[PDB]
């Protein structure tokens, strides 16, 4: 069911995506 | 210092012979005084100590992460599956005589940082020396032999 709720543990991965793209330096850069 | 604003400079160094030991054989690398806890109220120190003593026996990167579903009640059960006190403490023998410690100690691993600021970069003594020009008063900075 590629469409079900989203337990807590899951969210972590989302954040991963963030820094994967953005990056700790996001600000200064862009 | 630790990770809870737990500053502190060494006081003296001892070897295992004088060091306090637990039947297991193990002995502390660090021995912090119990008094820097109640007033500072840094349980997270006590907690990391119990949590790390666990993931150190089983080897499972103990999670400390922000707010989550962990508990002393929880850890104290896993640390009980390993045979050690459920709260971390352990019996210990007074390194000098070998005679047990009428008391028990919160003996468990904790992550500790070593900030620069080491003694030998600060001991400074001056008995007369370089004197400034405009003032003729001793000069500023240990760097320049000041007073």
């Amino acid at each position: 069911d590629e469409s079900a709720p989203i337990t807590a543990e899951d969210s972590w991965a989302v954040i991963s995506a963030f820094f994967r793209e953005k990056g700790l330096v996001s600000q200064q850069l862009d | 210092a630790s990770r809870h604003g737990q500053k502190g400079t060494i006081g003296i160094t001892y070897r295992r012979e004088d060091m306090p030991f637990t039947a297991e054989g193990i002995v502390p690398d660090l021995i912090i005084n119990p008094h820097a806890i109640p007033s500072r109220m840094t349980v997270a120190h006590l907690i990391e100590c119990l949590l790390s003593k666990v993931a150190a026996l089983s080897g499972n990167e103990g999670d400390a992460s922000p707010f989550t579903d962990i508990t002393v009640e929880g850890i104290s059960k896993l640390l009980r599956e390993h045979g050690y006190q459920s709260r971390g403490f352990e019996v210990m023998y007074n390194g000098h005589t070998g005679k047990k410690l009428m008391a028990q100690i919160f003996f468990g691993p904790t992550y500790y940082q070593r900030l620069r600021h080491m003694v030998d970069d600060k001991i400074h003594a001056r008995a007369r020396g370089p004197m400034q020009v405009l003032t003729r008063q001793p000069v500023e900075g240990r760097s320049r032999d000041g007073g």
Binding site: - | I12, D18, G95, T97, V119
Partner: protein
């Protein structure tokens, strides 16, 4: 920096006899020996055995301060009997105990086996 020299914990440097016995003046027939380059390892044990001699009135010791490898040992005895001797005896007591103890640990060892 001001780190004493490591080896100073067991090397009596220039004129420093192991022992040095000054007669305790506070009490009668009692003394105090200064042990240079020695500690609890040795101390506490001469304390134990020394404290078995019935003829020993007082026996206790102490490390002056953790920075210096030393300790004073105070010994008092039943008059006529010189504490020096008590220390003398109490010592051999330990040698004789150990000696036999070595023999006995070795007895057991020869009579053993394992593959590791």
């Amino acid at each position: 920096m001001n780190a004493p020299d490591r080896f100073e914990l067991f090397l009596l440097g220039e004129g420093e006899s192991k022992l040095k016995i000054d007669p305790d003046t506070k009490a009668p027939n009692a003394v105090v020996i200064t042990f240079e380059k020695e500690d609890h390892t040795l101390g506490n044990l001469i304390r134990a055995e020394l404290l078995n001699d019935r003829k020993v009135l007082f026996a206790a010791y102490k490390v002056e301060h953790p920075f210096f490898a030393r300790f004073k040992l105070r010994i008092q005895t039943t008059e006529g009997y010189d504490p020096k001797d008590a220390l003398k005896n109490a010592c051999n007591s330990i040698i004789n105990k150990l000696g036999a103890l070595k023999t006995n640990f070795e007895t057991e060892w020869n009579l053993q086996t394992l593959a590791a």
